[PDB]
Symmetry: D2
Subunit: 496 residues, 4 copies
Amino acid sequence: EKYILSIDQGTTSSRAILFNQKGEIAGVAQREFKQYFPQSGWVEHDANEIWTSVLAVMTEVINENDVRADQIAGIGITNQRETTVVWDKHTGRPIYHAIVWQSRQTQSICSELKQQGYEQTFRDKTGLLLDPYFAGTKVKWILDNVEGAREKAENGDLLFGTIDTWLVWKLSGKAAHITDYSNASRTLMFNIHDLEWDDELLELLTVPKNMLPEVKASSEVYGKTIDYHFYGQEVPIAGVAGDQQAALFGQACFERGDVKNTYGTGGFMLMNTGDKAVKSESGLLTTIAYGIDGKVNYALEGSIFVSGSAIQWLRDGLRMINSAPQSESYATRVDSTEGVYVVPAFVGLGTPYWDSEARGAIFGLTRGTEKEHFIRATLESLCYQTRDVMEAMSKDSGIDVQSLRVDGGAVKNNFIMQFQADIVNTSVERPEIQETTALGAAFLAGLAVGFWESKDDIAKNWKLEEKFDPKMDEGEREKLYRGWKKAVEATQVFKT
Amino acid sequence: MEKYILSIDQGTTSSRAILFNQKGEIAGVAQREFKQYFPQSGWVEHDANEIWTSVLAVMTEVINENDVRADQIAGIGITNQRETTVVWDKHTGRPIYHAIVWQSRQTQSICSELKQQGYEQTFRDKTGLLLDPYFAGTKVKWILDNVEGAREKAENGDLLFGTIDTWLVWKLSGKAAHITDYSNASRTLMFNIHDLEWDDELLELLTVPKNMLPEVKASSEVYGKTIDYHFYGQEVPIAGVAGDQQAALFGQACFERGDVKNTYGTGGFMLMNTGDKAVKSESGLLTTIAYGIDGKVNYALEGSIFVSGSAIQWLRDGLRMINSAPQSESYATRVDSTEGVYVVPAFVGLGTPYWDSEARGAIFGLTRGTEKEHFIRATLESLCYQTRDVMEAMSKDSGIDVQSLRVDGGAVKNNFIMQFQADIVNTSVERPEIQETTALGAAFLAGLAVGFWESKDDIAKNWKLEEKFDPKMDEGEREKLYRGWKKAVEATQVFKT
Amino acid sequence: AMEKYILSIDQGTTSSRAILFNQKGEIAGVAQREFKQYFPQSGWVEHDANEIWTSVLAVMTEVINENDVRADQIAGIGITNQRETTVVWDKHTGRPIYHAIVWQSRQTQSICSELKQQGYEQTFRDKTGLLLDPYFAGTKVKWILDNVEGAREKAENGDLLFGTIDTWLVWKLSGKAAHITDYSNASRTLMFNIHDLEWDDELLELLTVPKNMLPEVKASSEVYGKTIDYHFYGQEVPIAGVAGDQQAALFGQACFERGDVKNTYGTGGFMLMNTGDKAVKSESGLLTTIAYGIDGKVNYALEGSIFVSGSAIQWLRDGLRMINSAPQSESYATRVDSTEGVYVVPAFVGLGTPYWDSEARGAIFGLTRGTEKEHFIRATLESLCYQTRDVMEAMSKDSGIDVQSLRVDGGAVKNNFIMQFQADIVNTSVERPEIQETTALGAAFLAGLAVGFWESKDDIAKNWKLEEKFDPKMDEGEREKLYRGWKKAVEATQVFKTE
Amino acid sequence: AMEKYILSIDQGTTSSRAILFNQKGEIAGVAQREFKQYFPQSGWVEHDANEIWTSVLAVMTEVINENDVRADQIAGIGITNQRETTVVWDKHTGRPIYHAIVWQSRQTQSICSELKQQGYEQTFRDKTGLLLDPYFAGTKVKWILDNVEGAREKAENGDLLFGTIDTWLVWKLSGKAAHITDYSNASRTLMFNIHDLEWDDELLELLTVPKNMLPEVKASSEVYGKTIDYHFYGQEVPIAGVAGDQQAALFGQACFERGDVKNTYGTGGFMLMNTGDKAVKSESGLLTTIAYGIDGKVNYALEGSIFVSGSAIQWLRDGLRMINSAPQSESYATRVDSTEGVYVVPAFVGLGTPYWDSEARGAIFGLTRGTEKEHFIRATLESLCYQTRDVMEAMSKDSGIDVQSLRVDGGAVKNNFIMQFQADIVNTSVERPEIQETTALGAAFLAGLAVGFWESKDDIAKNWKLEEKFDPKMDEGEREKLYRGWKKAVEATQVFKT
Ligand SMILES: Nc1ncnc2c1ncn2[C@@H]1O[C@H](COP(=O)(O)OP(=O)(O)O)[C@@H](O)[C@H]1O
Ligand SMILES: Nc1ncnc2c1ncn2[C@@H]1O[C@H](COP(=O)(O)OP(=O)(O)O)[C@@H](O)[C@H]1O
Ligand SMILES: [Cl-]
Ligand SMILES: [Cl-]
Ligand SMILES: [Cl-]
Ligand SMILES: [Cl-]
């Protein structure tokens, strides 16, 4: 009996999942790694700790689930997008921390180009915009701030790569330095319209072309694992794609109209737009969904920087709760937040505001406000934000979603699901297997090595765990939303 | 068997009773809290009956547990939370509704009504206040309008209005006296601080009969004696009433003009004795009576802050984030800065100098790296930023420049706050050895009345410095922080449903 | 708005309470207040008498002012209280010469030992129906007279007055007009002869306590006097009821006839059984004391005492700061199916019925690494029950009667888990009344019946209504298994005794 | 430059640790990773053999990366471990057939009672230098073979292998090349005759354990083989050191001959004394076991065993959720002048030296209404000290020697209160080392010397640096009173049994 090992290197933890022929989870292993906040707005990881974590979950899932390494037909790698890494080709070590997709430490770089009118250029080519959110400015940051980098890059001693690249490069023993369309399209360097590194964007980002990896399809055998990194086995690595794109795939969203929403560190709703890249006029991102079978699908994306990450904050920042699940208890202990709103713009505001300078704020507080209200308010933010992007997309698409499929870590919190159904007046469908990112990447690989004959097995296996129906008249609905919007304005007013 | 003067400070969240010996020292202290009711957002109400029983409790407590008999009490001094209104049936002797607290924003509409009819300017020239839900007047009309049967009764002479002083003195004297003093009267919005009498016009606008009103009196004067049964068989003279903040002013020796002090309690209040000439303000400060004594009446400029220490108390009761108020200093000093975070505790709107009833509490500058220590520190700092706002507004209206400010109140104990205050305002902060000046002020008003003390001077010659905090930060860092503060406030006023 | 009410004051070990009662026997208002519990040394337990007075004075002011009831509508006052707690004060100044020594205190131990070693324990039993334990007032008095500087000089000049809480309250509240007590309270002083119904001159000499400090014993339902005006809002309301808190509970439970039994779960756990009017002698560790004095008659009863019951749950809260509130313990207990070998013996101040071991202290057993916080709390909650059973079997012998359904009351009866477990571990039905504060209800009637606010005591029975009956629900094997472990815990607990 | 290192793995009862030692004997890196503890039924303690492996494999990876050191810079590997803890796996699939039974578990009580009732206890004492307590490996294997379905018949077909953690780790790490154990670890199995040095046939039949499952007993400092490339980043580094954690700590403290005594405060408390090559029989509840095999020599030792020491604080944390971290405990304890009569006897898994009572369980005494966290927690911390004194005196009488300055180490030795009270309660100075992770240091040297990284063991004696000494500051009066009470608390504890 064979299996497909999937690695989901997320923003706050790494995960290894085994899938049997039937598309069931044969095992799961998870390890968190440190998050660094050196200065307000900044967010960084330690590339070496990420590697060792991914290397850890693998070893774990194999041992704890009684399955040989020689039973892995293939490996799929899906990851936190944009997070940049720059290492020494030879010593194989990062020359500096990985600047996470959330970090605002490249703001000035953006402001420079933005002030030179180049934003429009980046929008027309990358389908993105000039926000510190994307890989491009992070490389430039490293080459301009990290001593020696500039000259090491000129001597062809350095390599760039988003997490997908970083992992595959290490796992294959430096055999392959590649990335797929989806990941590449989130770098501000890749021209998503002609599908190739844009020379102009590179010069404009003062980034050498020798550091870039080869851009390949999302379901292809990029190589094999080196024996010592996989228990003496050379297992093929045949799947790569950004976590959210892989989730899209995992939800069986293969053509126009298909929309899904993921609640992880951040909140991300993507819609498959087929092979016709669609331009957004409401603050959505135009990006590549995935490359498979000679085709290249595009998609519209709505990005929320902080979603579940706001609960983690309640836990690690304010030490107000011990675990994410505990939050629900408080939230369900009060009829409402009684006027209190929480805008988690910890790293600016994404779709549709796109405000890098905005920071987390809280409003409507009164002597009577207590934990229950405060925590509940935080939980509700994941919903108010989803609506923000949901309506923004409903207008750039014209399509009107009526039953959204969800997934991610936070989707198991029932209050969040019901309140989401209510606040949007739409049904929310939660799957039996909520780890769709993992599942998605597993298929990109399984299909590439013939573990599965067709992607449709995914649509067929999808099982609804529970649907959530709206239970809140307009009266209250729009009142609450009306207030959220005011809360978001006020947030934007606070800037120094 | 030496005697003592009993002071009662009926504050916003607790009642206190304090004994004082000839030497002006504390012979004993008793405190006791009472429920704060928040029926709706912005609303604040107390149970007038629970306030009475609490006052009655602390008294019993302070004498029984300090080996001091009731017969050794030369006089009683009563100072209190201002504006809090109580409307009760003269006959039954019990309130017809919770006392509406000074912080309450439930009389908002009423204040708007009058504004839209263009009366605000009238109230300013007469009361020296303005049309904010902060003052008594509107709270009375509110009751008369919203409490079933309230009017039928109010117009039969069956009801009596009263701010806490009037309520306490009336009950304690066994219904013998239904009086108030100038200081308390000036905060009702129905008293003309220039004519020193109730204003018949203001009363008609607030649709408040003149029969419910108590008679204004001096601050130091024997208003009557406590009925035996509410004071252990004795008939002790009640000879001292005055708003809690004014009392603090008097207990700080701020007698002459230009004298300024700041109290850090549930709220933050900065009064400046303007002598005997009510100075007009154009920076958001109030004009009100300091005290009535020696046949004279002093005026003063006030800077008011609805939520100060109350914010720290919220970290405890609300977010159940700290065990005790003083436990906050622990966290604050654990991290070097707030790192961008600010806290604007407009739980019940903003006072001096913004005066925004609609405003609410908000927090800014948050990031994933924001830890619990930063959040609490930003709260402790807000008491200071707020004090600065008030201080600059007064520096203008008075033209005077404070080089060293005297302080008092429950929160002064916290050294972090005291130092940060001195830094952010760039002025020396002086903390007295006996910080409960409010209770000590009421002591002397009573004492001086019953001739327990010769002169008020004693307060000055007996006052002693506990510690003086002096500024210790650069100019750049100063304005940078204050710049963000104002931004925070600015943003906070934008959020209005 | 012109009905009258009866004010009941229950001055308990950890809190004071004031409760109003209408003609219909319903609660017209309730006011509670706590007071500091002093523990100067291990086993010592003391209150500040002054603080008790001011607390009683507080709940009164509170109950009338916040229930819209004037003082002039109070037909009478009932005063029931924590027993044994001794107070010694100067008649003149009117204030105590030392903290009140609570009934739990073990600071008078040596004194009890001395008397035992002189072979007097049998004497006190035949006379008081008690025994030489630091639990009763007598020894506490001598303790003060012996250890408080100048105590003797003054005690022998008539300058001092002894009194258990009832005496202290009535004296202060009556403005020094009455220095009395009733039979129920008196029988717990160790100086009162429960057979001759009078102070025993011999017992007093042994305790070296002058007869001039003693108050005069009276019936339980009788107008002892009127409250002085200034301590009751200008009114002179009659004080017409006094009786030990537990007895009151017995009366309020309608346990008037012989064979009647009830159990109270408060600071301690007390099981009284009205033995009619014939003091039954015990040989299983139960006490013999006066139930009440009413209608010209005097009833007796057998008592099973437990020093620490709900006080153990209160210890989880104040001591180990392990739970937020008492009722928050049920949450944990029901979270785990069993204690998994763990047992808690709360002999904080020794063991009462049926062990009577002053030297014993609290102990916990059956611990393992797997022992979680839930199990620990559950083990504490369960001890209230085990202890109840120990007392129950001892009484089943001394009376030969078999309880098939026990009535209960007290602060802890609210906790369902404890109720069910009691019903199970004892294998008997437990009945929880709708009005669980029977102790104050009892004091109410003693007063009311005196001042003629009610015709007969029968009303207490006709008006009593069941809230819920708990019925046994576990096998025989499991029952005894648990109880066998309990006794083992107890057995070991008595083995730990330092010098 | 071209600098080498010695990787040391310390597989402890509650966590696995990897430590790098440079030529100078300094720590070049540390990595720790806790693993789950299972308490299926009261008294039972078990670990998941696989999770243990994946943890050790984890700490290795971490220490190497985080500390920027190449795998090819490792001169050698040393493995030290939690003793007695048993593991039984399939020779072929390399999978344990059931959880590892931890040294603490009491789940083999009935087995002990059987043999104990048949008079065989004296047999085991005379041969193993131990006794019939569920604390040792022997009964655990039998438990597995008798209770785990299929085990019996798999063992008869030679499909199963036995091994204490050291063996398990070396067998996995070396790719099944080596299935060995050293003297120290072996001498804690109830199967190894410590007097003639070999698996005792009688004891084996008597434990119904096949001889084909037993590994080879080798010296404590010898190259047992190499790591397979895939379990060590493509490198085949030599595995040249094995020894029970406590023995390794003895060696680490520079206790090489008679008189040398140390005490470790980890999950459990263990004091060992080197008795040279003459195995000394104990008459006061101590254990006679092998210290280590090195240079053709095989030193013996006297050991005092306390099942629960630091493990009692962890309990306050995980069990009662009374504190958030072990270190926090001190805060409370230092906040009161005494426990005011409260005692805590953490017999969570029976009592060891010198009481040896498998039935005993944790108990608490001296409680009153005035007892509060500070007193409760402080009492717990003090138990670590009282228990040490129990064995200290028990050893001072079997040895005749009188210790007057004990060297200490372990996870709980960084808690000053515990060190000062210990000095006080015993009336002896307590010396705390700079490097308190001596177990790792010791194992590292067994390896390092085996591969020639170091020429002699004396380097250990010379590098030892005293971090802080603690002197007694408590008159007999109070001293003897407190201990007197402790003893009573222990008696009372033994009374509670069902
Ligand atoms: N029960 C829960 N309730 C609320 N939030 C949760 C819950 N479980 C996990 N989360 C949140 O989900 C996030 C982790 O989800 P995941 O999709 O694994 O992250 P990522 O997208 O970074 O891979 C965390 O930020 C966590 O706070
Ligand atoms: N819900 C509850 N669960 C368990 N114990 C309780 C609960 N409520 C109150 N208790 C306990 O009951 C006791 C209260 O005693 P009470 O019956 O009021 O009279 P007294 O104070 O005279 O003993 C306290 O010790 C308290 O811990
Ligand atoms: Cl809501
Ligand atoms: Cl700051
Ligand atoms: Cl149980
Ligand atoms: Cl001690």
